[PDB]
């Protein structure tokens, strides 16, 4: 346990050095061949690219500056890259390069070829408890790391968990994570994953990530989330009600864990008590979990994705392609100076 403390202190030193002096302008668009769109978002898309000097493949996020400014998201997008370039953990996707041009912001990161957990979950329907537990353990350790750095992720969901070659998770899309020691107030997240204190326009803290873990574990094990309805307003009513029902096949240990993660009173929620993350790590549902072995990636993964060599994108769905347009005039230069 002192070994955890030592590790986290060194991790904070490493993070803060990068956080305080972020890397800028480490590549250029012309160094990459654009191959395929792997996903989309509000201001752009993530594409498979090939670094032409080496032949190595990466995933490149491309954001249109003018679209970001239109939706008033300068601060979140700057912060996304600042976080990505500063963190270092086995289950966080690794930034390789970043740069900007007249039109766009670019983040070149590790290509994670196994596809989104969302894909696999919807395809299989649901995961066994051991399979779900394998993935949950990785998220527990990732939040221990992130929370030690005062980072609230705020967007946990299968859509953001990519599966690598070894069947382990890489978390992506830090597009509105926030570094704050105490509380914050913005309405942010994805409806099914929002903790009640967010919905109710209260102050909230990193405990919202532990609520979201409860949602994720439920969704992984059941195949559908604990709270759903046709429209977000109705989902929010279910979330604040404090009423969750479990499938007949959920174990007693799993139900007990979920009741403590999906605890509406944040002062009683696991992960937010005096013993912090250790209440989760020591819970009976995790009794077979060797936490060091998960961190070390020494546990055999329950699902190893098909991969046919470098650049294979067979685990990703198909998106309409657009050629990248770069304006002859610089757009929003002052606004994105720090990127």
């Amino acid at each position: 346990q002192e070994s955890v403390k030592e590790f986290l202190a060194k991790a904070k030193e490493d993070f803060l050095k990068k956080w305080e002096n972020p890397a800028q302008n480490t590549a250029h668009l012309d160094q990459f061949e654009r191959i395929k769109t792997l996903g989309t978002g509000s201001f752009g898309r993530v594409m498979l690219v090939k670094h032409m000097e080496t032949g190595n493949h990466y995933a490149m996020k491309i954001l249109d500056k003018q679209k970001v400014v239109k939706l008033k998201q300068i601060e979140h997008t700057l912060n996304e890259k600042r976080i990505l370039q500063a963190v270092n953990f086995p289950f966080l996707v690794k930034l390789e390069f970043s740069f900007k041009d007249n039109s766009n912001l670019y983040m070149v990161m590790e290509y994670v070829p196994g596809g989104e957990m969302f894909s696999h979950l919807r395809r299989i329907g649901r995961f066994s408890e051991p399979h779900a537990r394998f993935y949950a353990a990785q998220i527990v350790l990732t939040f221990e790391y992130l929370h030690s750095l005062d980072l609230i992720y705020r967007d946990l969901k299968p859509e953001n968990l990519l599966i690598d070659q070894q069947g382990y998770i890489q978390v992506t899309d830090f597009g509105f994570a926030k570094r704050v020691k105490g509380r914050t107030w913005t309405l942010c997240g994805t409806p099914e994953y929002l903790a009640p204190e967010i919905i109710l326009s209260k102050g909230y803290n990193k405990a919202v990530d532990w609520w979201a873990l409860g949602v994720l574990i439920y969704e992984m094990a059941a195949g559908y989330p604990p709270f759903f309805a046709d429209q977000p307003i109705q989902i929010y009513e279910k979330i604040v009600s404090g009423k969750v029902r479990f499938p007949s096949h959920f174990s007693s240990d799993l139900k007990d864990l979920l009741r403590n993660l999906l605890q509406v009173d944040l002062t009683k929620r696991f992960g937010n008590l005096k013993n912090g993350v250790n209440d989760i790590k020591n819970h009976k549902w995790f009794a077979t979990t060797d936490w060091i072995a998960i961190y070390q990636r020494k546990v055999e993964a329950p699902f190893i994705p098909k991969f046919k060599g470098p650049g294979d994108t067979s685990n990703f769905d198909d998106y309409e392609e657009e050629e990248i347009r770069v304006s002859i005039n610089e757009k929003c230069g002052k606004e994105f100076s720090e990127f």
Binding site: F118, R122, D155, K157, E159, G175, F176, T186, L187, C188, G189, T190, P191, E192, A222, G223, Y224, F228, A229, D230, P232, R245, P247
Partner: peptide, 20 residues
């Protein structure tokens, strides 16, 4: 069943984040 309710919800696809 709860599964049937989930399919009926229309929220089986990828879900976007929200804000004000």
């Amino acid at each position: 069943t709860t599964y049937a309710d989930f399919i009926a919800s229309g929220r089986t696809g990828r879900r976007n984040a929200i804000h004000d």
